[PDB]
Every structure is written in structure tokens, then in C-alpha cells.
Design a protein around this ligand. Structure first.
Ligand code: HEC
Ligand code: HEC
Lengths: 126, 126
């Protein structure tokens, strides 16, 4: 859906920005600094699930640019493992949110955050 | 979820960018320049439905900035009518996509596009 590489870059950066907001806005809830409303969190994690599937299709071959490292494309299998693993961490978060289980939510939230960082360490420029 | 107005601005601009891509990428399909795969379009419109609900919460009071016109906030009811009308145009598009009905898809796609423009004409700076 991208006329030029720059359009793929803009798309993925926007998708990742929205992910970061839908993830990060739960930090006060996880920490107990804001109240836990199970329905609110269930709905928010549903949005995050949808968003978390979006960036990867905008790293199609030849879409070097932005702060993407070239290693994304020199080993397509390893990058795919990282995004699939990330999305399965999001599945655990969804399951916790759907269950209304704050303890499971906290644990899953930490694992999701670790998975964001694991990808950045390998694939995002400083 | 926004520490400063700038964070709301960045969020809504990213959400609108993603909407524009999920909407605009169907133009060749509507025009018959690309093939119509009912399942592909159903899935894409589901994504668009989710995204189309997101920008509005990031025009909270005091989040003037970007290319948002101040009229968004001086008549909250009228802005809300426009975004709700837009989302109901998206509902028609969803219904068409879910039905696998290309004629209804075309018609709904045109009405959605008109609704984007109607809001821009009133509420987006040149
Ligand atoms: C690889 C499988 C990634 C996972 C998982 C996550 N992110 Fe990431 N992110 C990745 C790359 C390669 C890039 C650079 C994209 C580019 O072309 O520039 C990024 C970037 C971001 C950004 C900045 C977006 C922007 O506005 O330019 C943010 C805010 C971001 N990423 C956040 C984020 C969070 C919170 C994640 C887990 C919930 C996450 N990313 C996962 C690669 C990957
Ligand atoms: C009002 C109810 C709107 C509807 C419906 C749509 N858009 Fe719009 N859009 C609106 C505003 C007020 C703004 C400015 C936001 C800001 O603070 O700068 C915009 C902006 C866009 C953009 C630019 C985003 C960016 O990268 O800065 C795009 C690409 C865009 N809008 C597209 C778009 C499409 C395709 C719509 C219908 C499917 C649509 N918008 C609806 C207000 C409203």
C-alpha cells in the first residue's frame, strides 16, 4: 500500500507510536498509581492487539529508512521470530485483561515491555 | 494518556495517518484497478473500524496544536456530530465489506471519503 519507501516508514512509525501509547498508558494501572477497571483495560488491550499486528507489514523488502536497522532484512526469519514472539506476549496480556486478572496483567505487561526492548536492541538504530 | 498537548497532537496525527492508509489503500480495489478479495477487504475494514474510533479522544480540551482548528473546541457538540457521523459512514463500509458486496463497498467508500473532507473543511487548517 506504499508508493515509496518513505510511505512505509511513515506508516510503521505511526503504528509504533500508537502502540507505545496504548501500552504505556497502562503503566500507572500496573503500578497501582491509577485504579484498575477491568473493562477499561480489556478494551484498551483489544486496541493494542490490533495495533500490535500492524507495523510488520510496513517493513517490506526495500523499505530501509527511518531508524530501522538493515539487519531486519538480512535475516528475515529472525526478525519474523521477534515480531511473532512479541505478538504472542501481547496474547498473554490479552488473556490477562480478558480474565480481569490484575496479577497476570502485571506479569504480562513486564514481559511485553521486555519484548519491545529485545527487538529494539537488535533492530532499532540509536 | 498524554503528558503534554504535544503528545495528544502526535497521537492523533499518527492515528489519522494510519486511517488514511487503511482507507486509501482500497482505492484501486473500488476502481477495479486491483482485484476484489472479499476476505482481504473484510479484514482491512475491521482494522479501519478500530483505527477510526481513535483520533477523537486525542482532541481533549486544551490540546490545541498541529493543524487542528480552534473551532473543534468552541463547539464541542458540532465536532462530536462530525466524528460520530464519520464513524457511522465507517459502519456502512463495514456492513458492505462483511457482506462481500462490491457495489455497496463502492458507494460506502465514496460516502466515507466525503465525510473525511466535510470534517477537514470545518476543522483542519490549510
Ligand atoms: C521488532 C519486532 C519490534 C518490536 C517488538 C517493537 N518495536 Fe518499537 N521499533 C522497531 C523498529 C525497527 C523501529 C524503528 C522504525 C523506523 O523505521 O524508524 C521502532 C520504533 C519505535 C518507536 C518510534 C516510532 C517513531 O515515532 O518513529 C516507538 C515509540 C516504539 N518503537 C515503541 C515500541 C513499543 C512500546 C513496543 C512494545 C509495546 C515496541 N516498539 C515493539 C521495532 C520493534
Ligand atoms: C473530523 C471529525 C475528522 C474526520 C472525520 C477526519 N479527519 Fe483527517 N484530520 C482532522 C483534523 C482536525 C486533522 C488535524 C490534526 C492535527 O492536530 O494536526 C486531521 C488530519 C489528517 C491527516 C494528517 C495527519 C498528520 O500526519 O498530521 C490525514 C492524513 C488525515 N487527517 C486523513 C483523514 C482521512 C483519510 C479521513 C477519512 C477516512 C479523515 N482524515 C477523517 C479531522 C478529521
Amino acid at each position: 500500500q506504499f508508493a515509496k519507501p518513505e510511505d512505509a516508514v511513515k506508516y510503521r512509525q505511526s503504528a509504533l507510536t500508537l502502540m507505545a501509547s496504548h501500552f504505556g498508558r497502562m503503566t500507572p494501572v500496573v503500578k497501582g498509581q491509577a485504579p484498575y477497571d477491568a473493562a477499561q483495560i480489556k478494551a484498551n488491550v483489544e486496541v493494542l492487539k490490533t495495533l500490535s499486528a500492524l507495523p510488520w507489514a510496513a517493513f517490506g523488502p526495500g523499505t530501509e529508512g527511518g531508524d530501522a536497522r538493515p539487519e531486519i532484512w538480512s535475516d528475515a526469519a529472525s526478525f519474523k521470530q521477534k515480531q511473532q514472539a512479541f505478538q504472542d506476549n501481547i496474547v498473554k496480556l490479552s488473556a490477562a485483561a480478558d480474565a480481569g486478572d490484575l496479577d497476570k496483567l502485571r506479569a504480562a505487561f513486564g514481559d511485553v515491555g521486555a519484548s519491545c526492548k529485545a527487538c529494539h536492541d537488535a533492530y532499532r538504530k540509536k
